[PDB]
Scaffold this motif. Structure first.
Motif, PDB file in Angstrom:
ATOM      1  N   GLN A 607      84.097  29.131  42.426  1.00  0.00           N
ATOM      2  CA  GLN A 607      84.175  29.957  41.232  1.00  0.00           C
ATOM      3  C   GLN A 607      84.580  29.093  40.049  1.00  0.00           C
ATOM      4  O   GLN A 607      85.374  28.158  40.193  1.00  0.00           O
ATOM      5  CB  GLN A 607      85.176  31.104  41.409  1.00  0.00           C
ATOM      6  N   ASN A 608      84.031  29.409  38.881  1.00  0.00           N
ATOM      7  CA  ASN A 608      84.292  28.648  37.667  1.00  0.00           C
ATOM      8  C   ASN A 608      85.523  29.227  36.982  1.00  0.00           C
ATOM      9  O   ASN A 608      85.472  30.325  36.418  1.00  0.00           O
ATOM     10  CB  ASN A 608      83.076  28.682  36.747  1.00  0.00           C
ATOM     11  N   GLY A 609      86.628  28.489  37.031  1.00  0.00           N
ATOM     12  CA  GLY A 609      87.868  28.917  36.421  1.00  0.00           C
ATOM     13  C   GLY A 609      87.979  28.671  34.937  1.00  0.00           C
ATOM     14  O   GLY A 609      88.999  29.018  34.336  1.00  0.00           O
ATOM     15  N   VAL A 610      86.958  28.075  34.323  1.00  0.00           N
ATOM     16  CA  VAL A 610      86.938  27.822  32.891  1.00  0.00           C
ATOM     17  C   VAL A 610      85.632  28.358  32.323  1.00  0.00           C
ATOM     18  O   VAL A 610      84.644  28.542  33.037  1.00  0.00           O
ATOM     19  CB  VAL A 610      87.097  26.325  32.555  1.00  0.00           C
ATOM     20  N   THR A 611      85.638  28.611  31.020  1.00  0.00           N
ATOM     21  CA  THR A 611      84.488  29.175  30.333  1.00  0.00           C
ATOM     22  C   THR A 611      83.678  28.078  29.652  1.00  0.00           C
ATOM     23  O   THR A 611      84.091  26.919  29.568  1.00  0.00           O
ATOM     24  CB  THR A 611      84.931  30.223  29.308  1.00  0.00           C
ATOM     25  N   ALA A 612      82.498  28.467  29.165  1.00  0.00           N
ATOM     26  CA  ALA A 612      81.625  27.514  28.489  1.00  0.00           C
ATOM     27  C   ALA A 612      82.275  26.965  27.226  1.00  0.00           C
ATOM     28  O   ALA A 612      82.231  25.756  26.973  1.00  0.00           O
ATOM     29  CB  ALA A 612      80.286  28.172  28.161  1.00  0.00           C
ATOM     30  N   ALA A 613      82.890  27.838  26.425  1.00  0.00           N
ATOM     31  CA  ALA A 613      83.523  27.394  25.189  1.00  0.00           C
ATOM     32  C   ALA A 613      84.699  26.464  25.446  1.00  0.00           C
ATOM     33  O   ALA A 613      85.021  25.636  24.587  1.00  0.00           O
ATOM     34  CB  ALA A 613      83.983  28.601  24.371  1.00  0.00           C
ATOM     35  N   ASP A 614      85.344  26.579  26.606  1.00  0.00           N
ATOM     36  CA  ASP A 614      86.471  25.714  26.926  1.00  0.00           C
ATOM     37  C   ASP A 614      86.043  24.273  27.163  1.00  0.00           C
ATOM     38  O   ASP A 614      86.776  23.345  26.803  1.00  0.00           O
ATOM     39  CB  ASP A 614      87.204  26.241  28.158  1.00  0.00           C
ATOM     40  N   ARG A 615      84.868  24.064  27.752  1.00  0.00           N
ATOM     41  CA  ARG A 615      84.438  22.742  28.198  1.00  0.00           C
ATOM     42  C   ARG A 615      83.441  22.105  27.242  1.00  0.00           C
ATOM     43  O   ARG A 615      82.499  21.434  27.671  1.00  0.00           O
ATOM     44  CB  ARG A 615      83.852  22.829  29.602  1.00  0.00           C
ATOM     45  N   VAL A 616      83.619  22.302  25.939  1.00  0.00           N
ATOM     46  CA  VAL A 616      82.834  21.614  24.921  1.00  0.00           C
ATOM     47  C   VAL A 616      83.779  20.714  24.137  1.00  0.00           C
ATOM     48  O   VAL A 616      84.902  21.117  23.805  1.00  0.00           O
ATOM     49  CB  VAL A 616      82.082  22.594  24.003  1.00  0.00           C
ATOM     50  N   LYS A 617      83.351  19.481  23.892  1.00  0.00           N
ATOM     51  CA  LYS A 617      84.180  18.526  23.172  1.00  0.00           C
ATOM     52  C   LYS A 617      83.930  18.647  21.676  1.00  0.00           C
ATOM     53  O   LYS A 617      82.782  18.606  21.224  1.00  0.00           O
ATOM     54  CB  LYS A 617      83.893  17.104  23.643  1.00  0.00           C
ATOM     55  N   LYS A 618      85.005  18.798  20.911  1.00  0.00           N
ATOM     56  CA  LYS A 618      84.875  18.912  19.468  1.00  0.00           C
ATOM     57  C   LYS A 618      84.506  17.565  18.859  1.00  0.00           C
ATOM     58  O   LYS A 618      84.849  16.504  19.385  1.00  0.00           O
ATOM     59  CB  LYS A 618      86.172  19.435  18.851  1.00  0.00           C
ATOM     60  N   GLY A 619      83.798  17.619  17.736  1.00  0.00           N
ATOM     61  CA  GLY A 619      83.314  16.401  17.106  1.00  0.00           C
ATOM     62  C   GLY A 619      82.322  15.642  17.958  1.00  0.00           C
ATOM     63  O   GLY A 619      82.355  14.405  17.997  1.00  0.00           O
ATOM     64  N   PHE A 620      81.435  16.359  18.647  1.00  0.00           N
ATOM     65  CA  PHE A 620      80.440  15.765  19.538  1.00  0.00           C
ATOM     66  C   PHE A 620      79.083  16.359  19.171  1.00  0.00           C
ATOM     67  O   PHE A 620      78.643  17.344  19.769  1.00  0.00           O
ATOM     68  CB  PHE A 620      80.800  16.022  20.995  1.00  0.00           C
ATOM     69  N   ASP A 621      78.423  15.753  18.188  1.00  0.00           N
ATOM     70  CA  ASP A 621      77.145  16.255  17.686  1.00  0.00           C
ATOM     71  C   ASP A 621      75.992  15.495  18.341  1.00  0.00           C
ATOM     72  O   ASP A 621      75.234  14.764  17.702  1.00  0.00           O
ATOM     73  CB  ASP A 621      77.098  16.152  16.164  1.00  0.00           C
ATOM     74  N   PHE A 622      75.869  15.689  19.649  1.00  0.00           N
ATOM     75  CA  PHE A 622      74.823  15.059  20.442  1.00  0.00           C
ATOM     76  C   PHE A 622      73.764  16.089  20.802  1.00  0.00           C
ATOM     77  O   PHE A 622      74.088  17.167  21.311  1.00  0.00           O
ATOM     78  CB  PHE A 622      75.395  14.431  21.711  1.00  0.00           C
ATOM     79  N   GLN A 623      72.506  15.754  20.538  1.00  0.00           N
ATOM     80  CA  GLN A 623      71.409  16.653  20.860  1.00  0.00           C
ATOM     81  C   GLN A 623      71.222  16.754  22.369  1.00  0.00           C
ATOM     82  O   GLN A 623      71.427  15.791  23.111  1.00  0.00           O
ATOM     83  CB  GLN A 623      70.115  16.173  20.203  1.00  0.00           C
ATOM     84  N   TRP A 624      70.831  17.940  22.818  1.00  0.00           N
ATOM     85  CA  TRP A 624      70.582  18.201  24.224  1.00  0.00           C
ATOM     86  C   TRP A 624      69.204  18.817  24.397  1.00  0.00           C
ATOM     87  O   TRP A 624      68.707  19.497  23.494  1.00  0.00           O
ATOM     88  CB  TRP A 624      71.635  19.151  24.810  1.00  0.00           C
ATOM     89  N   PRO A 625      68.558  18.586  25.543  1.00  0.00           N
ATOM     90  CA  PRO A 625      67.301  19.302  25.816  1.00  0.00           C
ATOM     91  C   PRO A 625      67.479  20.806  25.800  1.00  0.00           C
ATOM     92  O   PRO A 625      66.592  21.536  25.341  1.00  0.00           O
ATOM     93  CB  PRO A 625      66.898  18.784  27.203  1.00  0.00           C
ATOM     94  N   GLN A 626      68.616  21.290  26.294  1.00  0.00           N
ATOM     95  CA  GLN A 626      69.006  22.687  26.160  1.00  0.00           C
ATOM     96  C   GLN A 626      70.391  22.698  25.530  1.00  0.00           C
ATOM     97  O   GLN A 626      71.333  22.114  26.103  1.00  0.00           O
ATOM     98  CB  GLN A 626      69.005  23.408  27.509  1.00  0.00           C
ATOM     99  N   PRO A 627      70.568  23.323  24.364  1.00  0.00           N
ATOM    100  CA  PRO A 627      71.893  23.307  23.723  1.00  0.00           C
ATOM    101  C   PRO A 627      72.983  23.932  24.573  1.00  0.00           C
ATOM    102  O   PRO A 627      74.150  23.538  24.457  1.00  0.00           O
ATOM    103  CB  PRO A 627      71.663  24.095  22.425  1.00  0.00           C
ATOM    104  N   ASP A 628      72.640  24.894  25.427  1.00  0.00           N
ATOM    105  CA  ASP A 628      73.622  25.522  26.299  1.00  0.00           C
ATOM    106  C   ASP A 628      73.919  24.708  27.551  1.00  0.00           C
ATOM    107  O   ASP A 628      74.918  24.982  28.224  1.00  0.00           O
ATOM    108  CB  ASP A 628      73.149  26.922  26.702  1.00  0.00           C
TER     109      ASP A 628
END
Ligand SMILES: [Zn+2]
Ligand SMILES: [Zn+2]
Ligand SMILES: [Zn+2]
Length: 798
Positions: A607-628
């Motif tokens: 089970q995932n004990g953390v959320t998507a918003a929790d595991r994003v690094k601030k000041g990290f403007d790197f393009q992704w094939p899928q932004p999510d």
RNA sequence: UUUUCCAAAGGCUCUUUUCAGAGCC
């Protein structure tokens, strides 16, 4: 009829441009592929660890020695050819550092076109012509297993033919490891030969390691710290220099009288540091003033294996060495379940430690009620907090001291820091070799505590006298030893929790003691006798923590691995019929990365004990094939190459791709310490280090800050962004140990924020697990190839 | 398609003074 002087040992094919002579083995071998996927000569080179190649007298080049034009290195695995821009004359140069240090500096020469001489596990045709298929099949055919057997016979004696493989029939194979036993003496008789074989192989492979004519900084220390700094000339390229080993230093020069001292390694290579440092336990008579003409040698020691054998015989002959129930369980005997009559604490939380989740609380309450409990700890589940809760409750039980051991000193340090966070009195036992090692928990070490033990002052006086001078008188030494033994005995009796290594539990200082509770940790990383060394101390309540899906212990002896020595005690207990309780929650990964390994290797239980918003690094403007989805697979069409050691692999194209993505990642604002590089092959790691250190397109220190390691070197470490290079890409061969699901597990679970996979899908798709990997990644539509700026979804299907 | 090439570890010895003694790191 009669084989010529230039004939293959395996088959005997005779042809001018088909036989290669080895200077190490004094034998000729063919380049034909044969029944096996690799050429005979390449197979002989890799198996016999030879590195010298001599061309045949007759051929396209004739009697030639394949030496680098810059340095003349004999190791063929590093040489490569460059066709001249003006004529057909080829230039043979080493890959590095001869690419940049070449004295020729020829205009027609370029290092970008450089290719290895060995391709597809065989020599290139223009150098050595591949024997024709019809001739190479019509002749004598030899299969891989008998090839290995004949190579072993050649190694143990340089006179062995085909008839020497069947007519003798040596056998003497070690007894295979069983699952269910009947007597402790049977256990000892079975596992003794395996341990002896492992020790003999380690001694053979480690004793042949020495260096001569080295320099030394030769700095001094106030408390008798003869600290010596020196750098390996990198010609031997031996990484066996390790913390805790013994180094004998010999000064055979005439500048000072001959000296033969003994010391231990205190500093191994590090990031841009190198300059290996050792500490000498000898007296002041060492030649400090001299720097050059210094000889060093590494001598193997048998302490660990002796401890394993002693534990085995103690278990065999002593009935009270273990509890009866545990003794019956370890032998596979079917006995009824037993419930420990212990008082359950009202609150399962630990003082000074974060509150456990429901799964961890259930695990604790189940463990405390069973004399034998197995815990399967998935990555990122906070197993350290759980084990801290266990030791806290065990100490609160008051059933004497509690023993904690772990195969790696890093795990021991983490666990002891965790338990000390609760304020409990903990004593950490360190070896003499590790006494000088500086650790965050070194203040809790036994020897340091003794140095800070102020109740008896004459012991401190003797200690400082020893620190300021050499060895004292015999009576003084005896008195000091007696005082130290008494003080350490008092400390150990007074201590509530004793933590050390699994092998370190065999120390005579810790001996003559009984422990009712043992919480062996990371057991899935240790051989069964290693985990069995501490338990013979009188175990009555016994807990294992580890994950079979993570990794297994590494064994070097081939015969031991075949006999089943690689199996851990955790695996045997699990297959015996005991279902291990597994933590169901974790906080280490963003849900996208953790979704797949949980589904595959943990049947969709994590089970995932953390959320998507929790595991994003601030000041990290790197393009992704899928932004999510902050992960993707980059497709590369490189070709694997044999490493310098002759048994690893590397790839230049994937190294360049890794450099590009790391440069982009640093351009994205990610801190350099966050960027990690993971490769399963040591040769690839070394090549990446060379490629990122000497040749840095961006700031050199910027590339320096990131770190690269092997899979299990990085396994005990957790970082934000990880980039994996799988290396292996061969059409006619296998992936190697990449088929092992444990390494895939740890590789996918080593991240916190993003994983960047680099490799060749075409070669990897053959293995079913990697095929599932590719299918899942394509379903997420993150298979990307081409320009980094212009990302394109790959059209390949698997 | 072979089996793979991958970490971690870590001081005692001798002598029948043996219920013991001696020496080394
Ligand atoms: Zn042959
Ligand atoms: Zn050879
Ligand atoms: Zn060279």
């Amino acid at each position: 009829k009669d084989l010529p002087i230039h004939a293959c040992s395996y088959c005997g094919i005779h042809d001018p441009a088909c036989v290669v002579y080895c200077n190490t083995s004094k034998k000729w071998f063919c380049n034909g592929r044969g029944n096996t996927s690799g050429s005979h000569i390449v197979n002989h080179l890799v198996r016999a660890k030879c590195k010298e190649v001599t061309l045949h007298k007759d051929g396209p080049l004739g009697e030639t020695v394949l030496e680098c034009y810059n340095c003349g290195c004999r190791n063929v695995f590093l040489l490569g050819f460059i066709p001249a821009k003006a004529d057909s004359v080829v230039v043979l140069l080493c890959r590095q550092p001869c690419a940049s240090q070449s004295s020729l500096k020829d205009i027609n020469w370029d290092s970008s076109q450089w290719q290895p001489l060995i391709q597809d596990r065989c020599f290139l045709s223009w150098l050595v012509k591949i024997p024709s298929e019809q001739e190479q099949l019509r002749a004598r055919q030899i299969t891989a297993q008998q090839i290995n057997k004949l190579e072993e016979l050649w190694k143990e004696n340089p006179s062995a033919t085909l008839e020497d493989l069947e007519k003798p029939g040596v056998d003497e194979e070690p007894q295979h490891v069983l699952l269910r036993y009947e007597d402790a003496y049977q256990y000892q008789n079975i596992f003794g030969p395996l341990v002896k074989l492992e020790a003999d192989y380690d001694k053979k492979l480690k004793e042949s390691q020495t260096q001569d004519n080295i320099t030394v900084r030769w700095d001094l220390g106030l408390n008798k710290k003869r600290i010596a700094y020196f750098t390996l000339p990198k010609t031997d390229s031996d990484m066996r220099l390790m913390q805790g080993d013994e180094i004998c230093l010999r000064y055979k020069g005439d500048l000072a009288p001959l000296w033969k001292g003994i010391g231990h390694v205190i500093k191994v290579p590090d990031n841009y540091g190198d300059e290996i440092a050792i500490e000498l336990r000898s007296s002041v008579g060492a030649p400090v003033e001299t720097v050059h003409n210094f000889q060093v040698d590494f001598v193997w020691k048998s302490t660990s294996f002796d401890r394993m054998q002693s534990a085995l015989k103690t278990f065999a002959v002593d009935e009270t060495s273990v509890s009866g129930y545990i003794y019956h369980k370890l032998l596979g005997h079917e006995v009824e379940d037993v419930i420990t009559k212990c008082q359950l604490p009202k609150r399962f939380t630990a003082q000074g430690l974060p509150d456990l989740n429901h799964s961890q609380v259930y695990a604790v309450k189940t463990v405390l009620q069973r004399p034998l409990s197995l815990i399967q700890g998935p990555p990122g589940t906070g197993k350290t907090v759980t084990s801290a809760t266990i030791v806290y409750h065990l100490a609160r039980q008051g059933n004497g001291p509690v023993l904690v051991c772990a195969p790696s000193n890093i795990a021991v340090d983490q666990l002891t820091e965790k338990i000390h966070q609760t304020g409990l009195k903990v004593v950490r036992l360190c070896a003499k070799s590790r006494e000088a090692i500086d650790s965050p928990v070194s203040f809790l070490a036994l020897h340091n505590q003794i140095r800070n033990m102020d109740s008896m002052p004459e012991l401190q006086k003797l200690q400082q006298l020893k620190d300021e001078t050499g060895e004292l008188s015999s009576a003084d030494e005896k008195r000091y030893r007696a005082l130290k033994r008494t003080a350490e005995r008092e400390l150990l009796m007074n201590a509530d929790v004793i933590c050390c290594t699994c092998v370190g539990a065999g120390d005579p200082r810790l001996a003559k003691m009984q422990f009712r509770s043992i919480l062996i940790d990371e057991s899935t990383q240790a051989t069964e006798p290693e985990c069995m060394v501490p338990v013979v101390l009188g175990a009555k309540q016994l807990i294992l923590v580890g994950d079979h899906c993570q990794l297994g212990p590494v064994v070097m002896c081939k015969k031991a691995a075949k006999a089943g020595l690689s199996q851990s005690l955790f695996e045997r207990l699990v297959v015996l019929g005991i279902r291990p309780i597994r933590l169901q929650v974790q906080y280490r990964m963003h849900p996208a990365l953790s979704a797949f390994p949980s589904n595959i290797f943990y049947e969709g239980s994590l089970q995932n004990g953390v959320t998507a918003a929790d595991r994003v690094k601030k000041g990290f403007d790197f393009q992704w094939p899928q932004p999510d989805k902050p992960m993707f697979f980059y497709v590369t069409q490189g070709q694997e190459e044999i490493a310098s050691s002759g048994t690893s692999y590397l790839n230049r194209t994937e190294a360049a791709n890794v450099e590009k993505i790391t440069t982009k990642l640093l351009k994205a604002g990610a801190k350099p310490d966050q960027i990690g590089i993971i490769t399963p092959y040591e040769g690839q790691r070394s090549y990446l280090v060379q490629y990122m250190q000497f040749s840095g397109s961006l700031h050199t220190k910027l590339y320096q800050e990131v770190e690269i390691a092997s899979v299990d070197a990085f396994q005990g470490r957790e970082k934000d962004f990880i980039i994996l290079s799988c290396v292996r890409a061969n059409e006619h061969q296998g992936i190697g140990f990449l088929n092992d699901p444990r390494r895939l597990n740890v590789a996918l679970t080593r991240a916190r924020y993003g994983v960047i996979i680099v490799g060749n899908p075409k070669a990897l798709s053959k293995q079913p697990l990697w095929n599932h990997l590719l299918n899942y990644y394509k379903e997420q539509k993150v298979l990307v190839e081409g320009p980094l700026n212009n990302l394109r979804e790959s059209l390949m299907q698997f």
